[PDB]
Design a protein around this ligand. Structure first.
Ligand code: 6MG
Ligand code: CA
Ligand code: CA
Ligand code: CA
Ligand code: CA
Ligand code: ZN
Length: 316
């Protein structure tokens, strides 16, 4: 909407206070004009018709319980925009500052979040498996990263290409979590998963097998559930990425870590220059090796560590 840029204040899902960029025109709207062509947050009102209505508020204060998922979807979309722009020189998900749209309060008891081809969508959870999913910065960045992938490599959402697609979203979700630097870790979704269980998470990149996901190509899922295991076999790539950054010895193979900034550079270049819609795990290894070669040189430690990490997870 046309209006003037304003700054509201509210509380997110976890009870933390933050300022949010809003727009005033009769109401105060969750419309942040400070980033690209805007970040827009909508109320889906417990329905499944999208996007719903642009979030309107009478007083620019967002402290009601019903407001909390909207505050966080809006704010964390801004952090994710900033990460891509400041770290990778990428302007929104399409590289040309496309408007970023999110809807919260999707459906009832909805234990998921997704990119629908055009926007982000967040359930509230059922209060047992999840609380409102926009409360996790890694979750928000995971979802926006699906849009980045779809506009770039275009990885088809099944089998190995789909598991790469998933891992890319977990990797960049985690790197955005580190960028914001509030309780960062290599776990996925811990802030919104299972409020009655402390210390768990939906997935682990440091130890995927803690939640049943494979950490070696020889343990890959070969069935048909979950689009051929896209949220399962992502563990193999998540583990490789963790090893590139942090190092370790895994199935007897030692990896010298190069840190999370270089991980991000290597995987961003692979995603945007070398991967294709049908890339498999072996082709991702080759793309990561080539990316590290471009950035650091063929004889570099960075290239050597990429090779060791993929060796450690059984991907040649
Ligand atoms: C980061 C996480 C909290 C949320 C993330 N959502 P996602 O990976 O983003 C779901 N995304 C999804 O299924 O996309 C398919 C699609 C939908 C609409 C249009 C086109 C394609 C995700 O991992 N979900 C699976 C969990 C909930 C399991 C337990 C595997 C069912
Ligand atoms: Ca209000
Ligand atoms: Ca965390
Ligand atoms: Ca996390
Ligand atoms: Ca939990
Ligand atoms: Zn995903």
């Amino acid at each position: 909407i046309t209006g003037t840029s304003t700054v509201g204040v509210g509380r997110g899902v976890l009870g933390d206070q933050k300022n949010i960029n809003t727009t005033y025109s009769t109401y105060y709207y969750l419309q942040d004009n400070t980033r690209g062509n805007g970040i827009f947050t909508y109320d889906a009102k417990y329905r499944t018709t999208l996007p719903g209505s642009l979030w309107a508020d009478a007083d620019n204060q967002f402290f009601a319980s019903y407001d909390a998922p909207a505050v966080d979807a809006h704010y964390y979309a801004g952090v994710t925009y900033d990460y891509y722009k400041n770290v990778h020189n990428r302007l929104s998900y399409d590289g040309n500052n496309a408007a970023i749209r999110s809807s919260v309060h999707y459906s009832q008891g909805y234990n998921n979040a997704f990119w629908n081809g055009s926007q982000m969508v967040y359930g509230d959870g059922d209060g047992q498996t999840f609380i409102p999913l926009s409360g996790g910065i890694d979750v928000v960045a995971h979802e926006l990263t699906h849009a980045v992938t779809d506009y770039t490599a275009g990885l088809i959402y099944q089998n190995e290409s789909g598991a790469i697609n998933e891992a890319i979203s977990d990797i960049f979700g985690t790197l955005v979590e580190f960028y914001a630097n509030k309780n960062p870790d290599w776990e996925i979704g811990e802030d919104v998963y299972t409020p009655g269980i402390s210390g768990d998470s939906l997935r682990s990149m440091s130890d995927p097998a803690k939640y049943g996901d494979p950490d070696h190509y020889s343990k890959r899922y070969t069935g048909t559930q979950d689009n051929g295991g896209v949220h399962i076999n992502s563990g193999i790539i998540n583990k490789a990425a963790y090893l590139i950054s942090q190092g370790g010895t895994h199935y007897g193979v030692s990896v010298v870590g190069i840190g999370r900034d270089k991980l991000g550079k290597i995987f961003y270049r692979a995603l945007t220059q070398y991967l294709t819609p049908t890339s498999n795990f072996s082709q991702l290894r080759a793309a990561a090796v080539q990316s590290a070669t471009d950035l650091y040189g063929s004889t570099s430690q960075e290239v050597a560590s990429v090779k060791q990490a993929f060796d450690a997870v059984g991907v040649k």
